[PDB]
C-alpha cells in the first residue's frame, strides 16, 4: 500500500487470481453504467475507486487507486478487522483451508479477527500499534478487552467512537441483510476515529476473495452481529 498526498492510496494487485479478482470487484461495483440498486448502495461503504493505475513508465506494474479513508483525520486511530466465519474461499485447496484455519482456529466461533490497530495516546502525543499476532491471540475470554483497547486513548475509553462504530456497522449489516448476490471471504472492516470529537469511518476493504452467490453471506452476518454485540458491551464499561 502506498500513500499519496492527493488523498488516495495505491494498492498493488496481489498475484493472480487474487489481484485480478479484486480489480474486477471494484470494476463491477463502480461500473459507470451500473443501475443495480444493491451495488449502488454498496458504494457508500467502500473506498471511492479511481480505477486501475500504473506508473507512466511501467504499464506492467498494476495498482488500484482508492480513497484514503484516513485522509480527513488529524490523528487517525485505525483498526482493521477481518470479518466472517471462514477466511478461505470456496475454491481453496485443503492446504489453504488448513493454513487459514490454523491462523485463527477461533474464526468460526467468533466471526471476526483483529488484524491490527494504531491508536493515538493523547498524554504522549504518540501512537501505539498492535500487529497480526495481537488479534490472533484473542480468545472468547479476552475478545472484549482486546477490541476495547482500540478505543482507549491512554486516559479514557472513547465510548463516542464505540457508539458511532456500532451505528455505522449497523448500516453495513442492513446492506448484507438485503443482498444475496455476493459473498465476502477474507474481507475487512477498516475503522477510523479521530484521536486528537465525532468523525468516524467504518469502510469495507480488501476484496481479493469476493464471489458471486445465491445465498445470504451468513458468515459475514454472524461476524458483524457478534462484533456489534462486543462493541455494545463495551458501552457498559
Ligand atoms: N482505502 C484505504 N484507506 C486507508 N487505508 C487503507 C485503505 N486500504 C487499505 N488500507 C490500509 O492498508 C492495509 C492493507 O490493505 P488491504 O487491502 O487489507 O491489503 P492486504 O490484501 O495486503 O491485506 C489495511 O489494513 C489498511 O490499514
Ligand atoms: O498475515 P500472515 O500471517 O502473513 O498470513 C496471511 C494472511 O492470512 C492473509 O490474509 C492471507 O491472504 P488471503 O487473505 O488472500 O488468503 C495470506 O495467505 P497467502 O500466504 O496465501 O498469501 C496469509 O499468508
Ligand atoms: Mg487485508
Ligand atoms: Mg487481503
From Swiss-Prot:
GO terms for cellular component: ciliary basal body; cytoplasm; nucleoplasm; nucleus. GO terms for biological process: inositol phosphate biosynthetic process; inositol phosphate metabolic process; inositol trisphosphate metabolic process; necroptotic process; phosphatidylinositol metabolic process. Keywords: Acetylation, ATP-binding, Kinase, Lipid metabolism, Magnesium, Metal-binding, Nucleotide-binding, Nucleus, Phospholipid metabolism, Phosphoprotein, Transferase. Ubiquitous, with the highest expression in skeletal muscle, liver, placenta, lung, peripheral blood leukocytes, kidney, spleen and colon. It is found in: Nucleus. Its cofactor is Mg(2+). Belongs to the inositol phosphokinase (IPK) family. This is Inositol polyphosphate multikinase.
Amino acid at each position: 500500500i502506498l500513500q499519496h498526498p492527493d488523498g488516495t492510496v495505491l494498492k498493488q494487485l496481489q498475484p493472480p487470481p487474487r489481484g485480478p479478482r479484486e480489480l474486477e470487484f471494484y470494476n463491477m461495483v463502480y461500473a459507470a453504467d451500473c443501475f443495480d440498486g444493491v451495488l449502488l448502495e454498496l458504494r457508500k461503504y467502500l473506498p471511492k475507486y479511481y480505477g486501475i493505475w500504473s506508473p507512466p513508465t511501467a504499464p506492467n506494474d498494476l495498482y488500484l487507486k482508492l480513497e484514503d479513508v484516513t485522509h480527513k483525520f488529524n490523528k487517525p486511530c485505525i483498526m482493521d478487522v477481518k470479518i466472517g466465519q471462514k477466511s478461505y474461499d470456496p475454491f481453496a485447496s485443503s492446504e489453504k483451508i488448513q493454513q487459514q484455519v490454523s491462523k485463527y482456529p477461533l474464526m468460526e466461533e467468533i466471526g471476526f479477527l483483529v488484524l491490527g490497530m494504531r491508536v493515538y495516546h493523547v498524554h504522549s502525543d504518540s501512537y501505539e500499534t498492535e500487529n497480526q499476532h495481537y488479534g490472533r491471540s484473542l480468545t472468547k475470554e479476552t475478545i472484549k478487552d482486546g477490541v476495547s483497547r482500540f478505543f482507549h486513548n491512554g486516559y479514557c475509553l472513547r465510548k463516542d467512537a464505540v457508539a458511532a462504530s456500532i451505528q455505522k456497522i449497523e448500516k453495513i449489516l442492513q446492506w448484507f441483510e438485503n443482498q444475496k448476490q455476493l459473498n465476502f471471504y477474507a474481507s475487512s472492516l477498516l475503522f477510523v476515529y479521530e484521536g486528537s470529537g465525532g468523525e468516524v469511518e467504518v469502510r469495507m476493504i480488501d476484496f481479493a476473495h469476493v464471489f458471486p452467490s445465491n445465498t445470504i453471506d451468513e458468515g459475514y452476518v454472524y461476524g458483524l452481529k457478534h462484533l456489534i454485540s462486543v462493541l455494545r458491551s463495551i458501552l457498559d464499561n
